[PDB]
């Protein structure tokens, strides 16, 4: 759906959202389109293992350096192992699967690390109701970290001001978290009619540049 997202993002950037006479941004809000999932926190151990992160529902997952991923559901015991080729597998920790003990151990170490050292992004936001997605890929730039989920969502966490973007092409929407940590969701199509502000417009512009990168990989 990365291709569908380049469409929507262009249309709105192509309409000069903030280059309007009167900007009626609040009119573009769509409470129903609130995301189901988004990355709460993350730790970069790619130097030796991979990248750990937590989803807003408290589940945790990791993308290992060997291109395999492991997810631990919020029940604290259910798992989901995805091999490189995308081959999903559903298991249980308590089932004590020898082949995965080392990676389970590492997954819990990230969980413990994020649990005592990091804040939970979007803590003051109730997601709408919905399987669990996994991190497909990710990368950082001098100015932000981009996270691409298996459900098609793309998240961009900006370093400087801590502002965040959560884009979804199924709902064709975007949720913008500002520096006050205010949390809002707009329907791309509407932001094209009613317009939006200057800082939201440039961020969406940066997002198209990030989606381009995601497609060229």
């Amino acid at each position: 759906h990365l291709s569908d997202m380049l469409q929507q993002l262009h249309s709105v950037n192509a309409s000069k959202p903030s280059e309007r006479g009167l900007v009626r941004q609040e009119e573009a809000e769509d409470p129903a389109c609130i995301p189901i999932f988004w990355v709460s926190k993350w730790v970069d151990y790619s130097d030796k293992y991979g990248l750990g992160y937590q989803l807003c529902d408290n589940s945790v997952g990791v993308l290992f350096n060997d291109s395999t991923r492991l997810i631990l559901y919020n029940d604290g015991d259910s798992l989901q192992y995805i091999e490189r080729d995308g081959t999903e597998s559903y298991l249980t920790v308590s089932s004590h699967p020898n082949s995965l003990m080392k990676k389970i151990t590492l997954l819990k170490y990230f969980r413990n690390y994020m649990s005592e050292h990091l804040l939970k992004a979007g803590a003051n936001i109730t997601p709408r109701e919905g399987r669990l997605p996994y991190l497909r890929t990710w990368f950082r730039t001098r100015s932000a970290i981009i996270l691409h989920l298996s459900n098609g969502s793309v998240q961009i966490n900006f370093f400087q001001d801590h502002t965040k973007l959560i884009l979804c092409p199924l709902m064709a929407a975007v949720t913008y978290i500002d520096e006050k940590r205010d949390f809002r969701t707009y329907r791309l199509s509407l932001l094209e009619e009613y317009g939006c502000c200057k800082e939201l417009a440039s961020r969406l512009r940066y997002a198209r540049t990030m989606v381009d990168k995601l497609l060229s990989s």
Binding site: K41, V43, D47, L118, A121, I145
Partner: peptide
Amino acid sequence: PPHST
């Protein structure tokens, strides 16, 4: 290592 906020 590098991490989120």
